[PDB]
């Protein structure tokens, strides 16, 4: 369910952000989304550990 989080973006899906916004800000939005997903994955890994 953490994959359906906006994490400060317009939407939780990435293709809409890629095909809608300009690449200078789309790159930043995808970077924020993937670093939020990585933080959630690291939290899940720590809990599993």
What are the residues binding another protein (CB under 8 A)? 22-24, 27
Query: Closest CB to another protein among 26 and 40?
Result: 26
Between 12 and 26, whose beta carbon lies closer to another protein? 26
Looking at the Cβ atoms of 5 and 25, the one nearer to another protein is 25
For 14-49, letters b (16+ CB in 10 Å) and e give eeebeeebeeeebeebbeebeebeeeeeeeeeeeee
Q: Provide the minimum distance between the beta carbon of 36 and another protein in the complex, in angstroms, as a whole number.
A: 22
């Amino acid at each position: 369910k953490q994959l359906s989080s906006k994490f400060g973006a317009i939407s939780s899906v990435l293709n809409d952000i890629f095909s809608r916004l300009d690449p200078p800000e789309a790159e930043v939005q995808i970077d924020r989304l993937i670093t939020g997903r990585l933080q959630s994955l690291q939290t899940y890994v720590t809990q599993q550990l």
